[PDB]
Design a protein around this ligand. Structure first.
Ligand code: FM8
Ligand code: MN
Lengths: 373, 357
């Protein structure tokens, strides 16, 4: 029985992970839960339902609303990871909260089932340095597919990695059409991922993660638009053979595989039914209209903290768009402007502080680009 | 540098295999060539162009010439691309020497069955068919206990989606050369499903067939978690040939890969087994076992030849297979020798001609 710590337990990935674990008590036992703090109601139900009292809340003010959370405030999730004996740490925390628990999980020797994108994109080689071969197992559909498809040959036999992309809500839109796009049109409803999916920045992040997880050069990582999202990614080998992973969209599949790696979890998700006719479409990404992916490749080839800069510039430009300060195509315009000025940030991140410094620099630089304009 | 005997060197597989070898001298060395005899013109051209004098139809002549070539030649890989019963004996000989058997000859498995499997150690037979090659690759996607289903793709032939009525008027020219006909009738897939059960040990009820007209995905494995792993490539037999020769190592530049710089779509649909029962009949014959699969194949051969001669309609090809198998309840017994296999086939051929009359 594998002891699992679920970080970011109240989001979509976390709840689905708990469902997989609840369905499979023979293979998994939850030994810890952590939440950012936005969905304290969910976490308290999770404590009541799992009987797990080993729980953390990052938001100090949210935790004080309850008064009996064992780890709270600054680095609560990291401390839970450091102090809990576990076989697997699932990291589905949001944004910046993910990095230090990723590093803590890796130092414990546990398998890291990684859902948090910022960890790898921002942390880069800082994170890779902390890991042994095979210790990081990806939770993202695309990277899970790749990991599975890579079993099709040896590393020297790999020619290309092909990521599929839905294309988002603006697939087939003109550059002129995007000028008028509103946040709500992108599926975003401002508050105290859906936008990054619309801008294709999410796909650029996945390209960076692909390079870091699997060690394949950026010019051998392709993106293909596949609106059905049935094929989740593919690997082309040196002999001409492509191996692909397919399933009806259901995140419980890649979540189960990361938890149970390398053993598959029986009945995790429904398989492709070929009793109905279906048609799977493939088309090139319109790189003229959606340059986010090529910009990610650019940041990634330059290297080091440039990927933290790419991500941080995106967050700030995206927030400006949600605020109504800039238009939609300006998001990737600002990312490009920030990277062009980021010559000091190609260095490898030596410490967590290097990452946070790069991110702070990038945000301020994006703010300057936003303000004028 | 692997030493390769090519049996059936003048046919399609044989010739593509030699091109693969010639392109990879550091990986491969041809140490022997064999052919039926009808294609002597190209066989002697193959001698002059490869410098191989170890040939069988000249040191080796006769019906057993290919077997004797295999027994006396030191070889790591024997590619058996002989068509028909010509391949059965050389299959056993190659297996006996301990060499890897890259199998393209459907008969030795479909007819031979247990006879061939008992002469082989696990992993000695490496399949050359694109569908089986695809499954072998996709099975790397999990461990044996995690396999839920093997899924073979079928082009569906020229009569994809036609009605039973539409089929009655089909001419030899419309159906596309027996290999081509076997694709039109879905008997090819029937034979591959039988071979799949035999090569991989998966029960017939977990071997599915799906129609995929593009022939890009060559087969898939669905695992117990809901994941399916598929193998895709533009159709080119040099890919599964190269892999069967270099197993488990891939051969750089064997075939062109899928290019996604151009838009395409891949269609999947069920086979209407009311209109195309060839695969279902293959499952039945397979489950019965013994000499029943030899009967399936033999009856097809005669029914197919009768269609190509204008004697029966297209739908009658599989109808004759069903008839012959329905009378073959005597043949659900395990074959003890090669002659037991040939007996069932002679019987099937004769009972098939009866139906044609
Ligand atoms: O890989 C392929 C293959 C697939 C597509 C194109 C060429 C090849 C190579 N090829 C071998 N023999 C003849 N061609 N096959 O294994 C052929 C079987 C399938 C098939 C499919 C389309 C056609 Cl036009 C024909 Cl004739 C046969 P099927 O109908 O059993 O699926
Ligand atoms: Mn994704």
């Amino acid at each position: 029985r594998l002891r699992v710590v679920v970080l970011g337990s109240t989001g979509s990935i976390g709840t689905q992970a708990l469902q997989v674990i609840a369905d499979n008590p023979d293979r998994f036992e939850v030994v810890g839960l952590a939440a950012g703090g936005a969905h304290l109601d969910t976490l308290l139900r999770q404590r009541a339902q799992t009987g797990v009292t080993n729980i953390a809340v990052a938001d100090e003010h949210a935790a004080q609303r309850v008064g009996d959370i064992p780890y709270h405030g600054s680095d609560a999730a990291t401390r839970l990871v450091e102090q809990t004996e576990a076989d697997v740490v699932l990291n589905a925390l949001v944004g910046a909260l993910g990095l230090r628990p990723t590093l803590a999980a890796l130092k414990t020797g546990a398998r890291l089932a990684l859902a948090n994108k910022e960890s790898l994109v921002a942390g880069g080689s800082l994170v890779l340095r902390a890991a042994r071969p095979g210790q990081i197992v990806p939770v993202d559909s695309e990277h899970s597919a790749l990991a599975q498809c890579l079993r099709g040959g040896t590393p020297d036999e790999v020619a290309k990695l092909v990521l599929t992309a839905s294309g988002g809500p603006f697939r087939g839109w003109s550059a002129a059409d995007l000028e008028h796009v509103t946040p709500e049109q992108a599926g975003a409803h401002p508050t105290w991922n859906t936008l990054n999916s619309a801008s294709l920045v999410n796909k650029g992040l996945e390209v960076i993660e692909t390079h870091l997880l699997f060690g394949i050069p950026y010019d051998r990582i392709d993106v293909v638009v596949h609106p059905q999202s049935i094929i989740h990614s593919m690997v082309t080998f040196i002999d001409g053979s492509t191996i692909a992973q397919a399933s009806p969209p259901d995140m419980k599949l890649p979540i189960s595989l990361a938890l149970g790696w390398p053993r598959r979890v029986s009945g995790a998700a429904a398989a492709c039914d070929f009793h109905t006719a279906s048609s799977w479409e493939f088309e090139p990404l319109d790189t003229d209209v959606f340059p986010a992916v090529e910009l990610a490749r650019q940041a990634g080839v330059a290297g080091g903290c440039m990927t933290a800069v790419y991500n941080a510039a995106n967050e700030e430009a995206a927030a400006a768009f949600l605020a109504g300060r800039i238009g939609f195509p300006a998001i990737v315009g600002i990312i490009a402007d920030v990277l062009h000025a980021a010559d000091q940030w190609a260095v490898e991140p030596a410490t967590v502080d290097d990452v946070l410094d790069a991110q702070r620099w990038a945000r301020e630089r994006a703010q300057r680009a936003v303000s004028g304009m």
